[PDB]
mmCIF file of C-alpha atoms and ligand atoms in Angstrom:
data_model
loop_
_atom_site.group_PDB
_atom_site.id
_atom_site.type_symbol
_atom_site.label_atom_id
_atom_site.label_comp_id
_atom_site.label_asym_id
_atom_site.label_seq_id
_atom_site.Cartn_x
_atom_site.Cartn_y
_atom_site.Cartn_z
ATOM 1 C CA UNK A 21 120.229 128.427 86.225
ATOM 2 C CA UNK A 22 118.941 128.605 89.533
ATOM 3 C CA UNK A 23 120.883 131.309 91.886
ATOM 4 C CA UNK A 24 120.828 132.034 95.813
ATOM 5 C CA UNK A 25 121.199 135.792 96.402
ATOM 6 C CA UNK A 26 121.328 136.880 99.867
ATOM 7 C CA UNK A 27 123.011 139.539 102.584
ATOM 8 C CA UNK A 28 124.451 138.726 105.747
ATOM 9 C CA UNK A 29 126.536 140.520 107.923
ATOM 10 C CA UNK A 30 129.939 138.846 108.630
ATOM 11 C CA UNK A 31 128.312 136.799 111.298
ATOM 12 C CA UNK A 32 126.196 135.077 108.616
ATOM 13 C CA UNK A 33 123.305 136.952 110.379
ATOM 14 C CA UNK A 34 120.935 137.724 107.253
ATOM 15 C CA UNK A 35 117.993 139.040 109.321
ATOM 16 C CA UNK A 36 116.888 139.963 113.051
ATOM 17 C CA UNK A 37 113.686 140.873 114.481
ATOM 18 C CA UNK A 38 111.675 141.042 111.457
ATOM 19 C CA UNK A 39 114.557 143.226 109.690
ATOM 20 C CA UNK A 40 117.556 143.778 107.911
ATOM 21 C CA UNK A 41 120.066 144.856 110.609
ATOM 22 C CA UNK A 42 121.601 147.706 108.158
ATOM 23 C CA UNK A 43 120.926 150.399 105.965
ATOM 24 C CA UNK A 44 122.754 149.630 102.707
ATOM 25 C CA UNK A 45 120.979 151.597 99.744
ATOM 26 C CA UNK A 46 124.153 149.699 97.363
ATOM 27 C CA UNK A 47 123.008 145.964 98.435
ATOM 28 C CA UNK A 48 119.073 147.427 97.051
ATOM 29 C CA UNK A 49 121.097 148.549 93.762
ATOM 30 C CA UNK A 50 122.916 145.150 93.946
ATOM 31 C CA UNK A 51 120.282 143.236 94.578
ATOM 32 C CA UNK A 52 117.929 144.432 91.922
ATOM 33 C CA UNK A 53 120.858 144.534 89.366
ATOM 34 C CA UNK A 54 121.525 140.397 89.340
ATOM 35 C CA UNK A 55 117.789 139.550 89.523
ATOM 36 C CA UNK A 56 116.429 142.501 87.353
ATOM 37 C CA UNK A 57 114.756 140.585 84.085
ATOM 38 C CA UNK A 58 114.561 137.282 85.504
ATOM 39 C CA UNK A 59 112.620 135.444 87.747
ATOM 40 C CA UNK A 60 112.668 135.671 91.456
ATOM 41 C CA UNK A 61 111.497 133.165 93.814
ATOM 42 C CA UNK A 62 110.521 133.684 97.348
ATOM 43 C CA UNK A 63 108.644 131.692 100.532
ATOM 44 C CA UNK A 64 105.281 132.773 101.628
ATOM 45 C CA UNK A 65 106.146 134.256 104.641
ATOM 46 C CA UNK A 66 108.675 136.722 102.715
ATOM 47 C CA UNK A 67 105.725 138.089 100.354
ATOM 48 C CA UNK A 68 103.790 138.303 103.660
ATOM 49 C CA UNK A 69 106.513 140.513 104.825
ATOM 50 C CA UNK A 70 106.510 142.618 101.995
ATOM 51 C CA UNK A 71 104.464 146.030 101.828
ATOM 52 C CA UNK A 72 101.488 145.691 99.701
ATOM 53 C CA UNK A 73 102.936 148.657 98.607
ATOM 54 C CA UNK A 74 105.786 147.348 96.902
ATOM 55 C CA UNK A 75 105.192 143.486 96.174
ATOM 56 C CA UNK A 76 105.621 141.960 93.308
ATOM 57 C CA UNK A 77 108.819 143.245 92.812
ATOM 58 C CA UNK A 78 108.786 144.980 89.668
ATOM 59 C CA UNK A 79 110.641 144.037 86.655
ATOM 60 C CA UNK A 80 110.693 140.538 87.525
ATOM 61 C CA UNK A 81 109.223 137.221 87.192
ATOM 62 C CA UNK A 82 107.624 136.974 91.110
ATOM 63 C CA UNK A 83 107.071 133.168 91.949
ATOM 64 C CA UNK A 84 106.079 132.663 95.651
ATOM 65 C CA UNK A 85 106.250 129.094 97.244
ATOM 66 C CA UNK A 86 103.062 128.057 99.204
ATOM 67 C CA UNK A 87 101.034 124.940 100.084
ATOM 68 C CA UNK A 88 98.209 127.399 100.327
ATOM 69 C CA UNK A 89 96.055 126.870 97.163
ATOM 70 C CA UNK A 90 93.864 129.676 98.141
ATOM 71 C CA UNK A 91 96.678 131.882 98.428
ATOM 72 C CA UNK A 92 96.187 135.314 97.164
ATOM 73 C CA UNK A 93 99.493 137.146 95.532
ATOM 74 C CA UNK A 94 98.741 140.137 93.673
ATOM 75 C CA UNK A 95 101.193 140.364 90.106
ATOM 76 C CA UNK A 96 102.726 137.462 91.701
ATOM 77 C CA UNK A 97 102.112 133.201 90.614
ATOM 78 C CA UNK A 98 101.827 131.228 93.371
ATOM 79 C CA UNK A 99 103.120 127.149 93.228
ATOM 80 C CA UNK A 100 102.842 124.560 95.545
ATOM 81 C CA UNK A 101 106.651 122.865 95.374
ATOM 82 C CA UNK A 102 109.977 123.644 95.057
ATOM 83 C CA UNK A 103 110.434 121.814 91.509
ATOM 84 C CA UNK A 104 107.617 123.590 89.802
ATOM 85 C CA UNK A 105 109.237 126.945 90.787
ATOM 86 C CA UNK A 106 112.660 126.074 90.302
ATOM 87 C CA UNK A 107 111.846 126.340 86.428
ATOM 88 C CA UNK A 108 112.568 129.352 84.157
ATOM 89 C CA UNK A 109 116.033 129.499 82.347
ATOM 90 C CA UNK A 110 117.183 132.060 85.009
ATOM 91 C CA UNK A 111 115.693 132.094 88.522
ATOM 92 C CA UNK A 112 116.804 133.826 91.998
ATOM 93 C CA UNK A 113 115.950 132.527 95.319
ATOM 94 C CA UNK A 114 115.557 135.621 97.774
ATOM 95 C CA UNK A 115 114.731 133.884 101.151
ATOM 96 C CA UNK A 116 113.946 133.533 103.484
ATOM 97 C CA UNK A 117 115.659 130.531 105.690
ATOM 98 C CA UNK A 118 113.013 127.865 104.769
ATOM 99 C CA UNK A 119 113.433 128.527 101.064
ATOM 100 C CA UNK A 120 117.000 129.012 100.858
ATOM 101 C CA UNK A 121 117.624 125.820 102.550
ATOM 102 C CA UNK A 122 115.344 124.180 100.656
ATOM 103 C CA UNK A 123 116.787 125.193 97.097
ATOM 104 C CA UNK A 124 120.592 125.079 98.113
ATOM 105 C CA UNK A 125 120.902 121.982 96.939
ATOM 106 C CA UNK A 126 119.525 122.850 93.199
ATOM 107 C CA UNK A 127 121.982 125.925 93.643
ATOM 108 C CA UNK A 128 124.967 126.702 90.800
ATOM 109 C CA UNK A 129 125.512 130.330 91.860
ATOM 110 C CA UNK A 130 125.523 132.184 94.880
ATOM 111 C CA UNK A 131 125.721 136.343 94.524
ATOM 112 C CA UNK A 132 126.339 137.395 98.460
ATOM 113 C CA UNK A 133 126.385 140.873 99.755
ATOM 114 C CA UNK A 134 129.040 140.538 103.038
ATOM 115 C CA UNK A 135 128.244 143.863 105.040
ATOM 116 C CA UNK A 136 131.221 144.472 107.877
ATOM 117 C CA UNK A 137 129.610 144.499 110.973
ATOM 118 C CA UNK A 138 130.166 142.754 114.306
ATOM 119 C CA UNK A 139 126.592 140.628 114.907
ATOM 120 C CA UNK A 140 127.548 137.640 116.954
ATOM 121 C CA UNK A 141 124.618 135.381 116.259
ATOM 122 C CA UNK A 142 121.848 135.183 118.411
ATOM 123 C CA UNK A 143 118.759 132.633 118.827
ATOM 124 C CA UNK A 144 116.149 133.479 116.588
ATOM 125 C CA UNK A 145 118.059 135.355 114.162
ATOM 126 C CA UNK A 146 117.747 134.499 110.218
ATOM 127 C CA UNK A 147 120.842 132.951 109.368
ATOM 128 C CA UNK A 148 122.518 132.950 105.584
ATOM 129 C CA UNK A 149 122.731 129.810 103.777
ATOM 130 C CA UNK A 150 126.004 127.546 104.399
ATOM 131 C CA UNK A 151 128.314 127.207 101.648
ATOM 132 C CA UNK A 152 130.615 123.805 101.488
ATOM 133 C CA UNK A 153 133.559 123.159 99.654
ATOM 134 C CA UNK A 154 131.538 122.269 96.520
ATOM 135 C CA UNK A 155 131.758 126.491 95.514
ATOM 136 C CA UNK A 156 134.381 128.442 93.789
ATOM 137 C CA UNK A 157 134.609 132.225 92.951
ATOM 138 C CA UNK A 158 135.449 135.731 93.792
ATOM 139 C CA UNK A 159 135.499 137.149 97.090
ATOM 140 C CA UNK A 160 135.728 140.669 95.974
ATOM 141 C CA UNK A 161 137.546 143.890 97.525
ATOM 142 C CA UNK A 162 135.993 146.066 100.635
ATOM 143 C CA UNK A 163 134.069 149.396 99.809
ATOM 144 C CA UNK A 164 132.684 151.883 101.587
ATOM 145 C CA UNK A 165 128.879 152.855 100.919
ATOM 146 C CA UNK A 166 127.496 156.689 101.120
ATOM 147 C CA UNK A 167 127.176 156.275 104.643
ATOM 148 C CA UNK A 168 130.308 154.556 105.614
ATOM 149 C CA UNK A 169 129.045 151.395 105.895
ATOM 150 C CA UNK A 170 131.685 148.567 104.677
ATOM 151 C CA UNK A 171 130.240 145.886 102.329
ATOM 152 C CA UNK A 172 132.198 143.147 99.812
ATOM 153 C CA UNK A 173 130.437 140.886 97.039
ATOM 154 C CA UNK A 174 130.849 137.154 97.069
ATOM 155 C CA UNK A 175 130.086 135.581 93.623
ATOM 156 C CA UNK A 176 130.382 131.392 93.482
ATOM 157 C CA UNK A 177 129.720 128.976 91.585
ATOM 158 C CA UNK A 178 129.313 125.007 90.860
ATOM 159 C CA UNK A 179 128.545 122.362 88.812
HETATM 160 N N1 ATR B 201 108.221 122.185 100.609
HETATM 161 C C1 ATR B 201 107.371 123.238 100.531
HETATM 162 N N2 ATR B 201 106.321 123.166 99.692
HETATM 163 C C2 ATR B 201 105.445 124.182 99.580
HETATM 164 N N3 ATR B 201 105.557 125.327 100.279
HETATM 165 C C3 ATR B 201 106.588 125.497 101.136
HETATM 166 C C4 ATR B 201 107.559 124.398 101.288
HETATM 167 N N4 ATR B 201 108.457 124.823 102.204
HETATM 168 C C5 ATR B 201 108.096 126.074 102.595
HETATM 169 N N5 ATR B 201 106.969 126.478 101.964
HETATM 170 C C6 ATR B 201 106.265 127.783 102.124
HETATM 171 O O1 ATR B 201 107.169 128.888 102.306
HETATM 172 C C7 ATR B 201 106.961 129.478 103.596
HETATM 173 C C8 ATR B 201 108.287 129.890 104.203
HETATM 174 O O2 ATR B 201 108.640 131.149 103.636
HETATM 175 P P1 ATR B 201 110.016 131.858 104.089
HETATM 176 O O3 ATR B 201 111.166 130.968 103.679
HETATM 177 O O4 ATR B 201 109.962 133.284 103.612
HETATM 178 O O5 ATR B 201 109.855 131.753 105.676
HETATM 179 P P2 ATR B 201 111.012 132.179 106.709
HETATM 180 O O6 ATR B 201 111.020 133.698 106.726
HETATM 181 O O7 ATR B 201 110.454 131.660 108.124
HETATM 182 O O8 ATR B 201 112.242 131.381 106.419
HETATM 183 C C9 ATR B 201 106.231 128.424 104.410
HETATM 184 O O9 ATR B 201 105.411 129.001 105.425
HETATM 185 C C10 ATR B 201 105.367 127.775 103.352
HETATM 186 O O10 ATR B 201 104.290 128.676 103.101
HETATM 187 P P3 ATR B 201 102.828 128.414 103.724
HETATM 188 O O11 ATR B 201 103.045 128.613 105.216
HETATM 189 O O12 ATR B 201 101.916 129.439 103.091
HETATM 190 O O13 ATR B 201 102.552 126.988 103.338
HETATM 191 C C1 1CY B 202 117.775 143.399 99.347
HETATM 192 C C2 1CY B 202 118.536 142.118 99.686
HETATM 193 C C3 1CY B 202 118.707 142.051 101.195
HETATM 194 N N1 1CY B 202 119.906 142.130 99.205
HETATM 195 C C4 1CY B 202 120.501 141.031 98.680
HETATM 196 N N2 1CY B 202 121.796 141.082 98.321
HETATM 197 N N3 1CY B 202 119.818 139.887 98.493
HETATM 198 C C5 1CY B 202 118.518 139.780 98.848
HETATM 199 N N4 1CY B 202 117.853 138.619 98.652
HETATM 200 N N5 1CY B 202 117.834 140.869 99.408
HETATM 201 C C6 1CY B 202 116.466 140.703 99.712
HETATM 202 C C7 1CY B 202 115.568 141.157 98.739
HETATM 203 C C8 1CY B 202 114.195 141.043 98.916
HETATM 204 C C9 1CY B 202 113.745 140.437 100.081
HETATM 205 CL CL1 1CY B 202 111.992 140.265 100.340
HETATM 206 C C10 1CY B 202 114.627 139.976 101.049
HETATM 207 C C11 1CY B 202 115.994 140.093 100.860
#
């Protein structure tokens, strides 16, 4: 089972500037709800990104990509190619760009946080993964966060 999880606003912007472009505490409760008890798996420059304060993510199998063999992750187990991380019964991708690309095409579920929000794309921006007519599954219905922020959950599949 290897799953792409990601959030991008309805743009397909995922990430500008170093950052999420929103404050959605509900895609954090999301997020660690699907991957909570399995393994995640992210690209270097994503753990690099990461407070030291907060990474590994707790709870959770942490795998981070690398062709650095000197490569020190904390908590974390570092491998050198996609195939050897692709592995455990249940895994996650989290980003970013290079990764998600990368293990699309091992991909039989997406879970996809759609915030509403007008971000026409711009260069540079992290962009979220493109899904072709290969997936199936539930767009589900618009809700408002705390803060009045309007967010849906995509969840597709695939053989
Ligand atoms: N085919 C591959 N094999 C091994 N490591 C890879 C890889 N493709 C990407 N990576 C790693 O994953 C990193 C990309 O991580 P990322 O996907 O979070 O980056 P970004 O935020 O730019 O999309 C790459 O820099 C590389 O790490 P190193 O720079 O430490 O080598
Ligand atoms: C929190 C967030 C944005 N939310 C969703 N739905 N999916 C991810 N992969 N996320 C994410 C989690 C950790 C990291 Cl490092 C980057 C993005």
């Amino acid at each position: 089972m290897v799953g792409l999880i990601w959030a991008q606003a309805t743009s397909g912007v995922i990430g500008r500037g170093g950052d999420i472009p929103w404050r959605l505490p509900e895609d954090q409760a999301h997020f660690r709800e699907i991957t909570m008890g399995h393994t995640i798996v992210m690209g270097r420059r994503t753990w690099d990104s990461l407070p030291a304060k907060v990474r590994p993510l707790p709870g959770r199998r942490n795998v981070v990509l690398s062709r650095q063999a000197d490569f020190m992750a904390s908590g974390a187990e570092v491998v050198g190619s996609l195939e050897e991380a692709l592995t455990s019964p249940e895994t996650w991708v989290i980003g970013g760009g290079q990764v998600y690309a990368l293990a699309l095409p091992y991909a039989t579920r997406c879970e996809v946080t759609e915030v509403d929000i007008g971000l026409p794309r711009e260069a540079g921006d992290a962009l979220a993964p493109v899904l072709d007519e290969t997936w199936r599954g539930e767009t589900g219905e618009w809700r408002f966060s705390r803060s009045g922020l309007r967010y849906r959950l995509y969840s597709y599949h695939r053989s």
